[PDB]
Amino acid sequence: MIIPVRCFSCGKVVGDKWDAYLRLLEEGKQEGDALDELKLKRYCCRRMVLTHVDLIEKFLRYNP
């Protein structure tokens, strides 16, 4: 259901990190590290993407 602008817990933005992440996966095969480099330190902002379930993808396969 798309990524959440700003993390609930602390507030830090997290909109941009999406495409970046899904790439550092496909190729560079990371998790922990990718994130670390994406500047996502403390678990609070962290859990947002790693727990995000992009439903929108299946929805987009729908007509209107």
Partner 1 sequence: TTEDCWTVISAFFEEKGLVSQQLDSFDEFMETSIQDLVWEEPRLIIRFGKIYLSRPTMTEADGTTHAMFPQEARLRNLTYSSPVYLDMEKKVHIGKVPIMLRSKFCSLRTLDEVDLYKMKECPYDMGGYFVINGSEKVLIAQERSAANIVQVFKKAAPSPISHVAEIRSALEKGSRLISTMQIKLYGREDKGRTIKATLPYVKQDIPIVIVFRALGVVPDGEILQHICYDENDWQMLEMLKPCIEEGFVIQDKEVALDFIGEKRIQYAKDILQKELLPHITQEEGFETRKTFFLGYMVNRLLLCALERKDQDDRDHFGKKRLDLAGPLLANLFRILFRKLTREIYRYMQRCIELAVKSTTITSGLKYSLATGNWGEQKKAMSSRAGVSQVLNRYTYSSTLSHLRRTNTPIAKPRQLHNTHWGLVCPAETPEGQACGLVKNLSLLSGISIGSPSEPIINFLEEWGMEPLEDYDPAQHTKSTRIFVNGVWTGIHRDPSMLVSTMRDLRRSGAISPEVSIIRDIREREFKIFTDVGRVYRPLFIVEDDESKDNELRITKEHIRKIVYGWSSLVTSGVIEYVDGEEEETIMIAMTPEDLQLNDTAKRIKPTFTHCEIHPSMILGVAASIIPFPDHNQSPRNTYQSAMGKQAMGVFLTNYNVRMDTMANILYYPQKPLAKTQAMEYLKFRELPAGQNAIVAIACYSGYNQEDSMIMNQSSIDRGLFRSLFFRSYMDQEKRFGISIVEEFEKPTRATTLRLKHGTYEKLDEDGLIAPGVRVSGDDIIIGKTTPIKRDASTPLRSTENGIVDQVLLTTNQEGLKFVKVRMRTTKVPQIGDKFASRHGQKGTIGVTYRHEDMPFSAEGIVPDLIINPHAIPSRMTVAHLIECLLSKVGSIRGYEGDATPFTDLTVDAVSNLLRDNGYQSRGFEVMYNGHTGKKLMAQVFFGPTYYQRLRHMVDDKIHARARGPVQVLTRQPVEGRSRDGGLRFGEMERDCMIAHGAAGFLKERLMEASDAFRVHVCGICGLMSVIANLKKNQFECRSCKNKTNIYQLHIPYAAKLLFQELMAMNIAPRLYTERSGVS
CB of 7: closest distance to Zn ion in angstroms? Answer: 3
Please tell me whether residue 45 binds Zn ion under the rule CB under 5 A. yes
Give the distance, in angstroms, between the CA of residue 10 and the centroid of all CA atoms in the same chain: 15
Reference 57, options 32, 24, 22; nearest CA is 22
Residue 51 CB, shortest distance to partner 1, in Å, is 5
Question: How far is residue 53's CA from residue 50's CA, in Å, rounded to a whole number?
Answer: 8
In the complex, the residues that contact partner 1 under the rule CB under 8 A are: 1-2, 4, 6-11, 31-35, 42-44, 46-47, 50-53, 55, 58-59, 61-63
Annotated binding site: 7, 10, 44-45
